[PDB]
Design a protein around this ligand. Structure first.
Ligand code: HEM
Ligand code: HEM
Ligand code: HEM
Ligand code: HEM
Lengths: 146, 141, 141, 146
């Protein structure tokens, strides 16, 4: 996959301003509130019943961060994501058999979350870099399939 | 498909978005070309450059009917079918882009009302967008 | 939605089904298994092997419900407004999977009736088979 | 991906008894019918006004013919599909620009066809090699993307 010197800035630049804590809680909380199907996989966490509770429960408010922080690992190397999420791609496919369209449903949820914490500080041309990222992510985690 | 709690959330976000449709629609659209250059094929006699005349005169209508669908929701499936042809029969849009516009429309709202588009309101619209999603692709299902 | 003509292709095929309910379903499911085994995990409490009294059992309902649903095609989300609550809330099913049954459910009809599944009548079913899938995943939309 | 002793046989053997004109013909046609949007894709095929004009559009069946014959070049290339479709992925991806959701669609309609022409000759255990087959093909048709 191709990346550039301008997409490297929109990405590496904005990464170092993400309050991972909250947005990783925000977007896992949303996934769980947005597509309610997405709740089955997270049975082990407890109370996910009322949309507002979903955020109050602090396993998501914890496990959420591990998603965004996850995305951390990538940013260090846009040029070996393949080998990065690969060990991680075994974890979502073999063990907890997760349908990758959902790898599109948090990527899309997680761009929306940046979207509300960076206002016009979130460039049309930016967002794009950030899809390409969580698009490249999405399908890395789906290496251990076809 | 779209119950009471939804109706209230959906109507809400709207009279919020309302009096800035001439730029909440242009933005959205200005974002679906710049993240998604493939949707550009539907626009090859369009001015695609940033901020142009044809996009803002357009986008205006993408909400102009996006909110006419909002304030008559008890029957989205009827008020929009007019286009559900232009979309389903005339231009024939791949349904996999109502999304790519579904979203780039929630990258606008988000930017300008990040404290209104709570998850639940985010849900209703994204399900109302799944409403204006299906009806506009009527000719297949 | 589904229109006057859809309302007769679909009614078409289920009449030609109708008497072998229990098989087509059981059979749709086996194929729902040995073709998409990552569907299995909703049935770890169930005998998933070709033609046990279980896929037989569970099969006739899957077929029965779908029929009861064309009998009153005019309202699929209230005739099945008992079965949606179940699926969408406790078993919680990923829609990805309704598209694995459906298609798998078609692939059965073909084997048993290739001249009844003429491409025109094929069209309306996948249609029907969306809306049923929708109805039953309604606690999301 | 792994093909085995019980997998090679049903692919190779069923392949050798498919009327590639008919099966290809009813293939492209269901897609042309069942999902009315792809017709723009084949706008330079002419009269595509009605299910019956569609089935008989000679060029429809002069297309289905070249699409099921393709698969055949893969039928012999199991462990080698990626290289096989190389250029033909650059056709759909970079050129034509078909949303990979359609590889699956024209995929799942093919399957549908094996059941029509072959009825009981189409075993559960057969179906699945005509699944995986079609999935893998679809996956290379998506190689010049991500
Ligand atoms: C945006 C793409 C995603 C990324 C990058 C990601 C990343 C991660 C990470 C970093 C872990 C940490 C494991 C640990 O702490 O031991 C994890 C585990 C897990 N993931 Fe994901 N994830 C994504 C999407 C999803 C989706 C859609 C689901 C399913 C709804 C999912 C389901 C899970 C589950 C159920 C666990 C572990 C549960 C447990 O600890 O018992 N992930 N993932
Ligand atoms: C929210 C759903 C959508 C709405 C409300 C919408 C709205 C509109 C409206 C109001 C028009 C002008 C038609 C008239 O005045 O008769 C139009 C035209 C058009 N639409 Fe959409 N649209 C939607 C989805 C899409 C998407 C995703 C695409 C691209 C893939 C698209 C492609 C087109 C094209 C190519 C035209 C032709 C107008 C021209 O040549 O300037 N539509 N749309
Ligand atoms: C047209 C779509 C479907 C129909 C008509 C259908 C039919 C049914 C019916 C009638 C029941 C409950 C009967 C009773 O308890 O009295 C049921 C439950 C169930 N459904 Fe479905 N179903 C469909 C889709 C799916 C799919 C695709 C899956 C795979 C994930 C699924 C998984 C289940 C499971 C695991 C149960 C629990 C049954 C048990 O454990 O006894 N359903 N279904
Ligand atoms: C399912 C796997 C597919 C395979 C193996 C395949 C194969 C091919 C081949 C071999 C050609 C033309 C090569 C030549 O004679 O020069 C072609 C052309 C074409 N294909 Fe596909 N295809 C597939 C899926 C699709 C899908 C899903 C669509 C549309 C939704 C599509 C649309 C087209 C179009 C529009 C052309 C151009 C025809 C022309 O200019 O002559 N293909 N494909």
């Amino acid at each position: 996959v191709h990346w550039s010197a301008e997409e490297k800035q929109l990405i590496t630049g904005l990464w170092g301003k993400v309050n991972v804590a909250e947005c990783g809680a925000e977007a896992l909380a949303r996934l769980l509130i947005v597509y309610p199907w997405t709740q089955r996989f997270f049975a082990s966490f407890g109370n996910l019943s009322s949309p507002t509770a979903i955020l109050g429960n602090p396993m998501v408010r914890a496990h959420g961060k591990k998603v965004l922080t996850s995305f951390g690992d990538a940013v260090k190397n846009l040029d070996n994501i393949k080998n990065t999420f690969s060990q991680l791609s075994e974890l979502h496919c073999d063990k907890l058999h997760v349908d990758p369209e959902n790898f599109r449903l948090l990527g899309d949820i997680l761009i929306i979350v940046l979207a509300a914490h960076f206002t016009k500080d979130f460039t049309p041309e930016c967002q794009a870099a950030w899809q390409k990222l969580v698009r490249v992510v999405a399908h890395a985690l789906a290496r251990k399939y076809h | 498909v779209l119950s009471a709690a939804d109706k209230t959330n959906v109507k809400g976000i709207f009279a919020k978005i309302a009096g800035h449709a001439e730029e909440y629609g242009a933005e959205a659209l200005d974002r679906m070309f710049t993240t998604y250059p493939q949707t550009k094929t539907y626009f090859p006699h369009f001015d695609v450059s940033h901020g142009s005349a044809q996009i803002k005169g357009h986008g205006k209508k993408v909400a102009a009917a996006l909110v006419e669908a909002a304030n008559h929701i008890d029957d989205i499936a009827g008020t929009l079918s007019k286009l559900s042809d232009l979309h389903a029969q005339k231009l024939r849009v791949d349904p996999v882009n109502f999304k790519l516009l579904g979203q780039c429309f929630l990258v606008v709202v988000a930017i300008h009302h990040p404290a209104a588009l709570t998850p639940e309101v985010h849900a209703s619209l994204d399900k109302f967008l799944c409403a204006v999603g299906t009806v506009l692709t009527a000719k297949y299902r």
